[PDB]
Amino acid sequence: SMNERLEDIALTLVGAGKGILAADESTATIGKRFESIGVECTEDNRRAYREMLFTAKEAMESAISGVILFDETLRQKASTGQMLTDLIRDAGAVPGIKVDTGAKPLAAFPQETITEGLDGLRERLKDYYTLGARFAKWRAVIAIDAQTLPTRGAISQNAQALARYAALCQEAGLVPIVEPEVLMDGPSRQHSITRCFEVTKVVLHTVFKELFEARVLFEGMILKPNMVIDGKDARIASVEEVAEKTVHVLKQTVPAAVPGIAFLSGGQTDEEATAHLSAMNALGALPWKLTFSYGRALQAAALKAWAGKNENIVVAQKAFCHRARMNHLAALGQWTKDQE
Amino acid sequence: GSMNERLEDIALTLVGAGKGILAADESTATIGKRFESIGVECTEDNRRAYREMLFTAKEAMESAISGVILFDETLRQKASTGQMLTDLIRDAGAVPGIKVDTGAKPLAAFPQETITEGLDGLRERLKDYYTLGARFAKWRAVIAIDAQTLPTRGAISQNAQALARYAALCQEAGLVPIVEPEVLMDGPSRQHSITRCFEVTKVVLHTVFKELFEARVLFEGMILKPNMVIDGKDARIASVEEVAEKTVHVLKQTVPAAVPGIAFLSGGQTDEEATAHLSAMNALGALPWKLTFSYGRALQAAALKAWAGKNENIVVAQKAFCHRARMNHLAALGQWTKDQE
Amino acid sequence: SMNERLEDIALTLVGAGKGILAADESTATIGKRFESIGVECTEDNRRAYREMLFTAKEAMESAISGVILFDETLRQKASTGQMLTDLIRDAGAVPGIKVDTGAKPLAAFPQETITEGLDGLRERLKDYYTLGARFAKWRAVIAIDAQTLPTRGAISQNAQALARYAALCQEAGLVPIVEPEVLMDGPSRQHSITRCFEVTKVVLHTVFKELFEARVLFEGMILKPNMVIDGKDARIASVEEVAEKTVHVLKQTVPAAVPGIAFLSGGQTDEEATAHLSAMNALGALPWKLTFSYGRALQAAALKAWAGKNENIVVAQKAFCHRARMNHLAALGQWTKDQEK
Amino acid sequence: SMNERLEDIALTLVGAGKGILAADESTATIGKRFESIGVECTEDNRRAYREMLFTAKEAMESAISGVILFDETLRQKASTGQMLTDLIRDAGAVPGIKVDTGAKPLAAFPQETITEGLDGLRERLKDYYTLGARFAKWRAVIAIDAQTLPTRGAISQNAQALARYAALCQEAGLVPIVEPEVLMDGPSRQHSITRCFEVTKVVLHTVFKELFEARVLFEGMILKPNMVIDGKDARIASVEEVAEKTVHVLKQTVPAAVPGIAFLSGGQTDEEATAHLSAMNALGALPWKLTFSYGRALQAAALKAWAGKNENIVVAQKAFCHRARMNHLAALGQWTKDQEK
């Protein structure tokens, strides 16, 4: 019955061509985004920006199954006085909560990271459940170059921490989003799509091996991986190649028991993220749903149009709704260049 | 590259169009045991007659059987009409294959468990078998089971490791390998529950695929031949529906979608159980792989009884084989009923 | 060179027949110990009790290479105004810091635990180094019973956390004590010495495998294991058998590169813990130093004599000094029962 | 008692400054050696050559604890009509048998190998025991270059084959020599001593991990590794550095429970091989015996001097006796350059 509840939550998050808004940027990460448009990163600006997204009615009702939140935001109220989690729920979306405390340097493995956040997590999860969160998220950052990175050590240690995080979540009634990101836009980003395929394959294999050993219910989780794609500074793979290779790697490494895969955008352009997802959804019947869990690819246009100003709310919401809808169509395999 | 693509094509043919595999690969000792039960002397010539009878059941072979697993001897044997037995198989649109393991032997330091031998010289044997018309291969790992101590992690991993060594060799030779890790329902202990079989099978398939992965086996170019999740032969209480459900469940958790097909062993189930179970699994809606059969006993026991070692009974024994072939053909399509007989 | 420094500190911690006072009890644990002798667990009483131990100059100067501390104590002043760690350093002992945050229930593994503490551990270690700590400690708790506990999953996950801890300690300039305790005094305490042998074997093997994968420098760490011993409520093994079996499991699992092994007392009586260590050091040349890292076995008698009373300070110091000396003798293989009198 | 006998055999093989004569070269391998000095590789020349070694009284009695034999040689008679195994036993040396069937290309791992010979091994071992063999040998060949080779896969599969062999040996009552050789003299051989150090470390770690899992008794086996040394065409490591790094990697990876380590010479010169072993034994107390299992380093000079002629038996036996003695002194840490005179 815990299993049944988790299964139902996971299915709702990937159901009916809908997908996840990744709005869970930590203070430093959102500060970086805000700084790129010359906006000051205050708490009120963060609230106002998020409120603008979460009251974007069309997108929130028709396209967004869930929203991943950062801790601050989960506890924040709208200007109207209503809890932001309650706005999210009034649109028929499920609130979720990012619980990792960041990717930190891994001792003895230079240029690689290990994600922290397991300490006190049982207790944080119970609190988050009480506040209405029904899923969680943890991000593992996997560095990549032509040959030396990533190491098996870094992969295994990150997969082990993901498994620990995932078992705890399920124990508290929350569906874990498991995010192992092979970086397309890291410090080294000239790798080929072939190199990304071989690394992603080993990463997903190890991730699922560790989830298995830690007794994680595959039916009650969601995978949020990178697509198989070349590095940002060496992009030559076509939309078709990206889609074909991505789905090929998933067939090999993601058990059919997993109900959905919601991709990260990872540095891709807005249109790329949509085109790639759409082409994967026209490759014939798949054992899991393929959808989006996009941060940048859902937000970057909204953020630029917003520009920190109240008078830009509507025009910001339009950009967000438009990208939400294109990605909805992508989740249905129905997107075309013409619809942009 | 092109060769990988070819391995997929062969693998897909073996599990496509509601067809399945005839497991006719009994070793000398094994087929001898099956002959002794019906009072027929186990000689080369009787083994040749028996198998020729199966392969000349035209309608069964043409319409139901995609491939035949053969033992070394049979692959090199002539039919009484002068052609190779493999010619008959190919004339019926079926693909010949070859069992390459040398039997499940006792595993040092693991009492009551076995390890399968046959890797020595396997590269050269595979090359020879390909020139003899074999396009796929087979290796059985035998996994013991009881309530709590068997099977050990060690016995499973060592078997999984030999299976992977085998699979990589087959694929390099151009043969699709059938990977057969059987958790015994009919072993020395056989009063275990279906929940126990579920858990054991889960760890076996997990470890098998972990080792296939590490040995760089192409999942798209192989076939799995597992037991179904079933209670022990002497404590059968689980329903058809529960066997179907729990089997499909464990496979969705452990068998990658890249694998084109799963062809079940009958394992000591009755003819009708094996058929019903397969049909009820294909009635559960859409799945990531094909579900079909690779049955020995469940395709053969009845025909062998009707044959009874006598040339006069070729017609009748063929009838009884044609029937089972057709029933399991319907099961593969999810169209079997007890009514179809 | 920073590798060479870790080696030096580790060697110092197990050298010259000296050993480690394990005084790192967390608030709840030291509370339980004070409650037994009817003493209120206040910050002041904890300070008073630790100050009594650290001012027992005879024992601290002769027997104690190092002191494992809890966070609070590392930051505490003596009644005389020095830092408590000044007293420890003056006696020639090295201060150390326990850095784990406790053994919590492990999701999906009923009745087993996982140790927390890795979050922010880099920054804590850095800060702890500036407070004078030159080694650290982390405890994995491994439950045990006749057949089901511990699970391989619980050991693996606990070994993996240990390895993460150890790599961080060495990066920060501190020697990690790696403490995987198979409990003799948990809920199940009627298990055999054979059962402990088999479980400790798997625990230590798994621990050193994970340390190896996480690039831990074996030459710059200390192991603090349980001795191989039957459960507390089913004690049959003689002194010789415990010593022999313990050394045997260590020769099988603990690399020669490790400089010292400092045992936990684990529920054994004060005399048992002394006698077992002495017997182990009377077995001839070994590839690592064998000494003590005792809590109860160095403190139980001193605590009882102290009885939360300033007037009992001298008598408590004498009790501690005696047990320190006996254990000093054990570390040299020179203890006999005569010398308790 | 099985354990106790394996242990005793193992101890004898590394005891008292003695070491193993590796004379188990297969037909193809001995043919390469013979062709080098212009001698036809016939069965009679192989018999005559080995007879010459095994009747070198002084060398066989004082330096050689055991002789590894190829199958053919184990079944061969001397010119006098006596079994060669009896000649070996009459000098106080124990006969042993190499049981692998060669290092073959590993499917899906270009430029790497996997060693065959597990099939029918239980039966071969039982026959070898009856014939007087009391230990066995199996060689895994690990390719090496600057970055890409060896792969984890190749190491794992070879370690797993090694463990299967070792378990079977012990069951039949033979002590398995476990030989995992990182090549200094394969296709690529300009790798540095640091690179060899890292590769050898992962190899030895993986080997012992798999032996552990396969329930191999550490106390009843012998390791035969390469020394830690740079490639043949990039030799810069001093004698002292090789000795030091070799002993370092062994303390990291080879359990104290293992009674002995007997190095392969691996393409080193005769003198290097002796000097390195001697330096290693001058580094103070070690947890295991360190000695030799030399093929080329004990024979090259004898073979050259023999030159395929009966006329040179004495001059060949003299050159073999001198190397046997130089290596005996090395096993004792007593070799010097001056003793070559």
Author numbering:
A (entry chain B): 0 to 339
B (entry chain A): -1 to 339
C (entry chain C), D (entry chain D): 0 to 340
What are the paper's exact sentences on this?
The glycolytic enzyme fructose bisphosphate aldolase (EC 4.1.2.13) catalyzes the aldol cleavage of fructose 1,6-bisphos­phate into dihydroxyacetone phosphate and glyceraldehyde 3-phosphate. It also catalyzes the reverse reaction. The hallmark of a class I aldolase is the presence of an active-site lysine residue which forms a Schiff base with the substrate. The structure shares the typical barrel tertiary structure and tetrameric quaternary structure reported for previous FBPA structures and exhibits the same Schiff base in the active site.
Here, we present the crystal structure of the class I fructose bisphosphate aldolase from B. henselae with the reactant bound at the active site. The purified enzyme crystallized in the apo form but failed to diffract; however, well diffracting crystals could be obtained by cocrystallization in the presence of the native substrate fructose 1,6-bisphosphate. The final FBP-bound model contains four copies of FBPA including three residues of the four-residue N-terminal purification tag and residues 1–340 (of 343) of the protein; the FBP ligand was modelled in each monomer. Here, we determined the 2.35 Å resolution crystal structure of BhFBPA. This structure has clear electron density for FBP bound at the active site. There is a covalent bond between C atom C2 of the linear FBP molecule and the Nζ atom of Lys223 of the protein. Furthermore, phosphate group 1 of FBP makes hydrogen bonds to three amide N atoms as well as the side chains of Arg295 and Ser264. The alcohol groups along the linear carbon backbone of FBP also make hydrogen bonds to the side chains of the protein, as well as to nearby water molecules. Finally, the O atoms of phosphate group 2 are hydrogen bonded to side chains and to nearby water molecules. We compared the active site of BhFBPA with those of homologous mammalian enzymes. The similarity to the active site of mammalian FBPA A suggests that the design of a specific inhibitor for BhFBPA (that does not inhibit the human enzyme) would be exceptionally challenging and would have to rely on exploiting very minor differences in the chemical environment in and near the active site.
